[PDB]
């Protein structure tokens, strides 16, 4: 699964 902390700027929504 994606790591949401790889780029904090990305809101996966």
């Amino acid at each position, epitope marked *: *699964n*994606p*790591d949401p*902390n*790889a*780029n*904090p*700027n*990305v*809101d*996966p*929504n």
Partner: antibody
Amino acid sequence: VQLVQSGAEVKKPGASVKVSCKASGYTFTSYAIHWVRQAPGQRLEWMGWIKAGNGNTRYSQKFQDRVTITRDTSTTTAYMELSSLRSEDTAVYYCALLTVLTPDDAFDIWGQGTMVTVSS
Amino acid sequence: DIVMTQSPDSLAVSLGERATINCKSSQSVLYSSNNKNYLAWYQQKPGQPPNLLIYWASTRQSGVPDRFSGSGSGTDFTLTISSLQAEDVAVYYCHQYYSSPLTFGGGTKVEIKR
């Protein structure tokens, strides 16, 4: 949205350099500023990010012991210090708001880049 | 490390022809639970920083001309320039934001034949 970096520098092998990144045109404290370097003929290399409001950081495994990213919220400026400079560190260093994808908006902005030359 | 591999390394086409750039990710960047591909495409002209063209694999960023389009899902991604214009000479990079560290492809240099 705008990112403005300090000018190019030369530093001896073993010394440190501290590149600056002044931001403007947006809410500084809401996003993370990344640092990415583009070495001669090599692909872009992510170094780390810093959360501008909070100050938390995450560093690439490459640049763990030698990089320190920091911010000053009052001047809207992020910094990247790289120490024990080595031959391979000559490169253009960018700060960037990489892929800011919010419910409200989507933007991606890069500083103009700062060329650091490691030389005696 | 998600390795991003682009192909071809460079491509020369005449003005107005179609340009196809391929990018393969060494693991899937699709999250099935939201059906999003954590992939972006960048354009870099000399003297300039990379410029974001596409994100979420196929969403063109505001202001990007309509001739740039991304497609693909999972590991196999494609940037298409439907009709190359002279100002499109640049290096094009793919980029993943699925896992840390963020990584970029090796670049595809697009040149004009004239």
